[PDB]
Amino acid sequence: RRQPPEEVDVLVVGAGFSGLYALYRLRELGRSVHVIETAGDVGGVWYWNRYPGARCDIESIEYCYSFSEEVLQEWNWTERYASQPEILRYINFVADKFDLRSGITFHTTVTAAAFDEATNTWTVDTNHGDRIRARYLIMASGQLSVPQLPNFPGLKDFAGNLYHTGNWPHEPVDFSGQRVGVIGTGSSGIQVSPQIAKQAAELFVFQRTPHFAVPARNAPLDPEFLADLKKRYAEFREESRNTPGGTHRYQGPKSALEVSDEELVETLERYWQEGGPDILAAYRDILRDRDANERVAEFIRNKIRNTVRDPEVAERLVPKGYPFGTKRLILEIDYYEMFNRDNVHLVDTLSAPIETITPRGVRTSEREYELDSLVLATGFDALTGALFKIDIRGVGNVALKEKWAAGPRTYLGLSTAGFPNLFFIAGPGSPSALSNGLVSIEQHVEWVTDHIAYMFKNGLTRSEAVLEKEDEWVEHVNEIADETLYPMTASWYTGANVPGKPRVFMLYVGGFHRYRQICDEVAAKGYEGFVLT
Amino acid sequence: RRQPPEEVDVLVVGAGFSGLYALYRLRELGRSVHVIETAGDVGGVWYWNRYPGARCDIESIEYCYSFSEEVLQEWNWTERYASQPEILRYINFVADKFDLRSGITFHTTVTAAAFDEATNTWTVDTNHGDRIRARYLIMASGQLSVPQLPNFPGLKDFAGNLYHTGNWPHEPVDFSGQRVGVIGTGSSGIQVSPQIAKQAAELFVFQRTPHFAVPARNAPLDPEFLADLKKRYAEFREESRNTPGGTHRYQGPKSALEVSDEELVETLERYWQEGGPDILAAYRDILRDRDANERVAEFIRNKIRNTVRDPEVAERLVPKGYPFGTKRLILEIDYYEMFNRDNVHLVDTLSAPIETITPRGVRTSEREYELDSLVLATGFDALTGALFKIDIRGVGNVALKEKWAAGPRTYLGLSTAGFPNLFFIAGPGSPSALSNGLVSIEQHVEWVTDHIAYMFKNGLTRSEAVLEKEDEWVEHVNEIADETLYPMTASWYTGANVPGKPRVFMLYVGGFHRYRQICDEVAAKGYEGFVLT
Ligand SMILES: Cc1cc2nc3c(=O)[nH]c(=O)nc-3n(C[C@H](O)[C@H](O)[C@H](O)COP(=O)(O)OP(=O)(O)OC[C@H]3O[C@@H](n4cnc5c(N)ncnc54)[C@H](O)[C@@H]3O)c2cc1C
Ligand SMILES: Cc1cc2nc3c(=O)[nH]c(=O)nc-3n(C[C@H](O)[C@H](O)[C@H](O)COP(=O)(O)OP(=O)(O)OC[C@H]3O[C@@H](n4cnc5c(N)ncnc54)[C@H](O)[C@@H]3O)c2cc1C
């Protein structure tokens, strides 16, 4: 409804944390710049993923922008880990303060883009038939999206109230008096279920694969601590930029294999009581050594058995057969304790898979469960899912989707050869999802917008990764992943392992500070490994 | 070039073992019937997969047709496990004997099919613009196909001779005097490499994931044994139909967890010396128990260490971290022994991934390898890959591809609700690939063609799976797989595991004889769970 321009220096796709700061920084650099966004307003995942209990897994004081001193001083975070509604208020504040919505077209989806060698510009199409010409195209389209899979058979026949964590109602849902089922126990399930358990007459949790989760120990943020922080906030964030994960997480010196059982328990118990994801770096080899991971995993398995009263239920909740911490660590608030309530029932759908959703509830091989309400607590698509929905055509009319079918091929995760003037923010080939996202997002946005300012300053109009450096980068990302446990998790690859065909690991796991040094050296040498004309 | 008919009772897609016997049996039942095949002649995988060393992993006397007494008496198998060229001669003989090519259109690919409720017929299109109307559609399109993945970067710049195991030249390739590289050590790599090692000046084997393989102990077939067999061949094959795997494999009574190390070694060593895949049923829980698999796996790991002289090379060849025998067991002929030759070199591409194919050879992170010839020893697509290349549209114009995106949904693996008059031979939801394929193929073809004869006999024209029985079957297949180790192998699922979304295991693992009883009871009760009109 705000009409997009016919021509612009830079077109940004997406208005979450990434896209908003791209828009802002490009305005400040003196460029013309516009955003296209599917949703009705700003916030990205914090706008669309609004189920009760949705909460960030990184501390509030770390998971924020640092580019504006006034923002840092004006915003008052209220809790140790911020809720989705509070994050969304923060993002809306940033957008209101800097008048960013004047540069955004909402309710609009980019459907295709192709590059014109004659003009060195992209022509971009949308689902309202807009056609936009942009010199540069910035994909701020995110890592998480709705999976592209049919639902459980029979879902549409359910006769009660049906809710999706991925599209939760805007007004609050009261489950008082109700028999409620939750299907899925990844991130959304673990976060939403204890909130539902507070209200429901009965809650059935349908679990397929059990996931690891550790206690949040969420707490109000001491105002006095926040005031001290604000006096040195800039020094604090420059410390965060100088770590492997983009936060103040203590780095664990010892091997988990070298301590006595006694020392291990004493160390891991301190982390369990403190809460949060810092336990991932309790020891140095948790993600490097099969035996060392299994040790830390076993302690967490025992905490689950200690918490849940019924030993048979406890054992069903115990994750088995796959490594700990090779995905972002889920923080839980009374999720294990929940199973001690008399009105909460775990249904193990590995023993008895779901046969069908029925008008009455859920049928497995053992029995029907009658429900008044059903909640689908869905997981997420592959990290490349959003991008693959757009028909992106580069040199030779080649589809990005075809080129990246064995895994995303990029130079520094920022650009791909054959697709000039196209940049990816916090996506594949970079630290992205395995680090404090806001630290990664700001580093990318600064690098890409500074690069784009350099082009205009030097009279250049086309920027493209060199094919050889892209091949070297992909190989380098594989080589360092192959020294870790991350490759045991199939979901970091696109498609199955096939002899005689390449396979690309999704992300750079060498550490944020290392990655940043690499990018800074590339920029300082005049964009070594890009071809600028 | 033989023109396909305008209208037929049954159209068969594919002219391998499955399609040829469908064609034959439908002719004998008095129906009109025609085949469409991409290749220039018969044989399916035995026609297109023709690299040196390609060989069946099931004994010759078991891996053959049994529907013709004259075929059984006339054919003389020469070896314990038959080579691809010998299998292809057998299939060409069957086709020559029964004049089957008069019913086949070669060089032609089916591209789309849609169902017409008004006529109860399929209309099928091909890539030569043929349009065929068929009452019934039989997919004999196979389990193995070319993977849909980009090649290694730089492959097209290789300046030497480039060979693909999936499309090997028709005239013999002489590697004498040459430096040769093989990339891929699944089935094709393990079979082709020792043949190349006999001729090459130097051979580099580029291994990513090491696979398990056991010795074939191939040997000529004693003519006197074959003569005795032929006098009771019918009794012998009825014994084969009465087993879990469709062969005479001894079924192992004991747990691998209950014997002394001593008894284990003595038992497994006898199997190692006898050769072949019967070791899979040495004990009863090899595929049921994590600890019991790991025990049998460790013995095989030690055989590898015993065979290969250089302990460092041996350890790189040792498969680690995934279970033994959850895929079809590869039989090797001097593959481990090959690494003891002075002209054979293993390159571990987990430590040093391939960066690029170069005009000279292969570059990894450590070094370039100069080669005169490069062989890509490719793996295979998902089992659903062939079917997904055809635009199949059922009731409501729904795409089979969309319906099966979380995994193939079928009743008995034969048919899917919403796609009437369509049958799958030896595909998902049945024993198919985890059993002697010829036993499975003949059971399916007999069941489907008898079903089709019943329809015509009773004046019926539309056959469709009942949605409820399809849901029950899918659930049943998941439930019995979930009691085994098969689900640890990601490749039996289509796409990643996603919370809140269904996941279907590809195959029925309950045993061939059990599956056959199920199908026979369904037919005996008038096709219970199909809707016939
Ligand atoms: C419950 C939960 C907990 C989390 N915890 C953490 C944590 O502890 N640490 C961490 O780093 N991250 C966490 N995250 C992740 C969060 O995704 C990232 O930190 C960050 O918010 C990503 O922002 P973005 O702007 O890059 O992408 P997004 O927020 O995904 O925004 C992308 C936007 O692009 C739009 N878009 C996509 N395609 C198109 C198109 N074709 N046309 C128009 N618009 C399009 C989408 O609609 C969306 O609004 C969590 C996320 C959730 C849901
Ligand atoms: C090296 C090797 C070893 C093997 N060892 C064993 C073993 O030990 N045991 C076992 O059971 N199996 C084994 N097999 C597997 C073998 O695939 C099956 O046993 C059997 O041959 C399958 O026959 P089919 O007729 O169903 O399919 P296929 O032989 O795959 O024939 C399908 C045909 O359909 C054609 N087709 C596909 N789509 C279309 C279309 N759109 N239009 C026209 N034509 C189309 C293809 O071109 C192909 O010719 C092995 C295979 C190989 C390659």
User: A208 to each of A366, A390, B94, B494, how far by Cα in Å?
Assistant: 15, 32, 48, 17
In ligand 1, which atom is closest to the CA atom of A84? 1
The three-state secondary structure class of A339 is coil
Residue A14 CB–ligand 1 contact under 6 Å: yes
User: A361 to each of B132, B204, B409, B474, how far by Cα in Å?
Assistant: 44, 59, 21, 19
Residue B399: which residues within 8 A CB-CB, separation 6 or more?
A: B391, B392, B393
Q: Is residue B393 located within the same domain as residue B527? A: yes
Residue B386 CB–ligand 2 contact under 6 Å: yes
Strands annotated E in B14-63: 33-36
Residues of A in contact with B477 (CB under 8 A): none
Residues of A in contact with B476 (CB under 8 A): 365
Instruction: From A451, A512, A481, A479, select the one nearest A29 (Cα to Cα).
Output: A451
User: A192 to each of A316, A381, B32, B203, how far by Cα in Å?
Assistant: 20, 19, 59, 57
Method of determination? X-ray
Residues of B in contact with A490 (CB under 8 A): 490, 496
Chain A residue closest in CA terms to B357? A471
Q: Give A372 to chain B, closest Cα distance, Å.
A: 18
- A-proximal residues of B, 207-226, CB under 8 Å: 208-209
Q: Is residue A326 located within the same domain as residue A417? A: no
Six-digit token pair at B305? Answer: 């260490």
Residue A311: which residues within 8 A CB-CB, separation 6 or more?
A: A305
Does residue B396 sit at the A interface (CB-CB below 8 Å)? no
User: B318 to each of A193, A275, A310, B211, B243, how far by Cα in Å?
Assistant: 44, 40, 41, 8, 32
Cβ proximity of A193 and A182 under 8 Å: yes
Exposed / middle / buried, residue A171 (Cβ in 10 Å: 0-12, 13-18, 19+): exposed
The three-state secondary structure class of A156 is helix
- Residue in B352, B376, B476 nearest the CB of A500: B376
CA A296 – CA A258 distance, rounded (Å): 12
Note down the domain range covering B74. Answer: 1-149+381-533
Strands annotated E in B29-141: 33-36, 104-105, 110-116, 121-126, 131-139
Q: Is residue A514 located within the same domain as residue A385? A: yes
Amino acid of residue A373: S
- Which of B346, B380, B414 terminates a domain? The answer is B380
Whose alpha carbon is nearest atom 3 of ligand 2?
B56
Residue A122: which residues within 8 A CB-CB, separation 6 or more?
A: A11, A113, A114, A115, A116, A133, A134, A135, A136, A137, A421, A422
Cβ proximity of B137 and B124 under 8 Å: yes
In ligand 1, which atom is closest to the CA atom of A188? 1
The rounded Å distance from CA A145 to ligand 1 centre is: 8
Residue B109 CB–ligand 2 contact under 6 Å: yes
Does residue A396 sit at the B interface (CB-CB below 8 Å)? no
Q: Which of A145, A157, A351, A471 to mutate to test the interface with B (most CBs of B within 10 A)?
A: A471
Amino acid of residue A269: E
CA B287 – CA A477 distance, rounded (Å): 35
Q: Is residue B118 located within the same domain as residue B187? A: no
Whose alpha carbon is nearest atom 20 of ligand 1?
A437
Residue B19 CB–ligand 2 contact under 6 Å: yes
Other C-beta atoms closer than 10 Å to the C-beta of B335 total 24
The rounded Å distance from CA A120 to ligand 1 centre is: 29
Q: Is residue A12 located within the same domain as residue A105? A: yes
End-to-end CA distance of chain B: 36
End-to-end CA distance of chain A: 36
CA B113 – CA B136 distance, rounded (Å): 11
Does residue A184 sit at the B interface (CB-CB below 8 Å)? yes
Exposed / middle / buried, residue B118 (Cβ in 10 Å: 0-12, 13-18, 19+): exposed
Residue B106: half-sphere exposure toward Cβ, Cα within 13 Å? 12
Residue A469: which residues within 8 A CB-CB, separation 6 or more?
A: A411, A528, A529
Q: Is residue B494 located within the same domain as residue B346? A: no
- A-proximal residues of B, 32-91, CB under 8 Å: none
Report the residue among B2, B24, B45 best suited for mutation to probe ligand 2: largest number of ligand atoms under 8 A from its CB. B45
Other C-beta atoms closer than 10 Å to the C-beta of B528 total 11
Q: Is residue A318 located within the same domain as residue A186? A: yes
Does residue A354 sit at the B interface (CB-CB below 8 Å)? yes
What CATH number does residue B533 fall under?
A: 3.50.50.60
Say if the Cβ atoms of A490 and B496 lie within 8 Å: yes
CA B242 – CA B145 distance, rounded (Å): 30
Say if the Cβ atoms of B186 and A479 lie within 8 Å: no
Among all bound ligands, the one having the nearest atom to the CA of B433 is: 2
Q: Is residue A22 located within the same domain as residue A121? A: yes
- Which of B336, B353, B380 terminates a domain? The answer is B380
The three-state secondary structure class of B355 is strand
Say if the Cβ atoms of A209 and B497 lie within 8 Å: yes
* Helix (H) / strand (E) containing A507: none
Residue B240: which residues within 8 A CB-CB, separation 6 or more?
A: B62, B246, B247, B248, B436, B439
The three-state secondary structure class of A84 is helix
Six-digit token pair at B510? Answer: 């309950």
Six-digit token pair at A328? Answer: 């972002």
Q: Give A351 to chain B, closest Cα distance, Å.
A: 7
CA A220 – CA A225 distance, rounded (Å): 11
Does residue A402 sit at the B interface (CB-CB below 8 Å)? yes
Exposed / middle / buried, residue A118 (Cβ in 10 Å: 0-12, 13-18, 19+): exposed
Say if the Cβ atoms of A353 and B409 lie within 8 Å: no
The rounded Å distance from CA A227 to ligand 1 centre is: 29
- Residue in A405, A495, A499 nearest the CB of B377: A499
Whose alpha carbon is nearest atom 26 of ligand 2?
B142
Q: Which residues of A293-331 are buried (b: 16+ CB within 10 A; e: fewer)?
A: bebbbebbbebbeebbeeeebbebbbbeebbbbbbebbb
Chain A residue closest in CA terms to B498? A379
Chain A residue closest in CA terms to B376? A500
Instruction: From A120, A74, A97, A129, select the one nearest A21 (Cα to Cα).
Output: A97
CA B39 – CA B386 distance, rounded (Å): 14
Cβ proximity of B159 and B34 under 8 Å: no
Residue A141 CB–ligand 1 contact under 6 Å: yes
Instruction: From A319, A320, A155, A379, select the one nearest B496 (Cα to Cα).
Output: A379
Amino acid of residue B503: R
Six-digit token pair at A308? Answer: 């849940």
Say if the Cβ atoms of A475 and B379 lie within 8 Å: no
CA B62 – CA B275 distance, rounded (Å): 16
- Which of B380, B413, B430 terminates a domain? The answer is B380
Six-digit token pair at A241? Answer: 């930029």
Instruction: From A17, A5, A21, select the one nearest A44 (Cα to Cα).
Output: A17
- B-proximal residues of A, 415-474, CB under 8 Å: 467-468, 471-472, 474
Please report where in the chains the tokens 């529907």 appear, as a residue.
Answer: B67
Exposed / middle / buried, residue A73 (Cβ in 10 Å: 0-12, 13-18, 19+): exposed
Q: Is residue A370 located within the same domain as residue A401? A: no
Among all bound ligands, the one having the nearest atom to the CA of B112 is: 2
Residue B414: which residues within 8 A CB-CB, separation 6 or more?
A: B423, B424, B429, B430, B444, B447, B448, B465, B519
Q: Resolution of the experimental model in angstroms, please?
A: 2.0
Cβ proximity of A216 and A331 under 8 Å: yes
CA angle B242, B246, B250 (to 5 degrees): 80
- Residue in A351, A381, A501 nearest the CB of B151: A501
Q: In whole angstroms, what separates CA A74 from the centre of its chain?
A: 26
CA B62 – CA B236 distance, rounded (Å): 9
Cβ proximity of B280 and B296 under 8 Å: no
Other C-beta atoms closer than 10 Å to the C-beta of B58 total 23
Beta-sheet pairing, A373-376 with A161-164: parallel
Cβ proximity of A294 and A212 under 8 Å: no
CA A78 – CA A218 distance, rounded (Å): 11
Exposed / middle / buried, residue B234 (Cβ in 10 Å: 0-12, 13-18, 19+): exposed
Q: In whole angstroms, what separates CA B9 from the centre of its chain?
A: 28
Instruction: From B100, B89, B124, B110, select the one nearest B39 (Cα to Cα).
Output: B110
Instruction: From A228, A283, A236, A278, select the one nearest A258 (Cα to Cα).
Output: A283
Total of domains in chain A: 2
- Residue in B471, B491, B499 nearest the CB of A496: B491
Q: Is residue B348 located within the same domain as residue B387? A: no
Residues of B in contact with A147 (CB under 8 A): 498, 501
Cβ proximity of A465 and A360 under 8 Å: no
Say if the Cβ atoms of A471 and B501 lie within 8 Å: no
Q: Is residue B326 located within the same domain as residue B226? A: yes
Say if the Cβ atoms of A378 and B499 lie within 8 Å: yes
The three-state secondary structure class of A22 is helix
CA A51 – CA A40 distance, rounded (Å): 18
Cβ proximity of A344 and A456 under 8 Å: no
Phi, psi angles (nearest 5°) of residue A164: -120, 130
Say if the Cβ atoms of B149 and A475 lie within 8 Å: no
Six-digit token pair at A423? Answer: 């940049």
Say if the Cβ atoms of A149 and B380 lie within 8 Å: no
The rounded Å distance from CA A44 to ligand 1 centre is: 5
In ligand 2, which atom is closest to the CA atom of B145? 30
Among all bound ligands, the one having the nearest atom to the CA of B41 is: 2
User: B375 to each of A251, B151, B191, B225, B342, how far by Cα in Å?
Assistant: 46, 12, 12, 39, 20
Say if the Cβ atoms of A188 and B500 lie within 8 Å: yes
Say if the Cβ atoms of B409 and A500 lie within 8 Å: no
CA B389 – CA B511 distance, rounded (Å): 30
Does residue B205 sit at the A interface (CB-CB below 8 Å)? no
Q: Is residue B21 located within the same domain as residue B113? A: yes
The rounded Å distance from CA A11 to ligand 2 centre is: 49
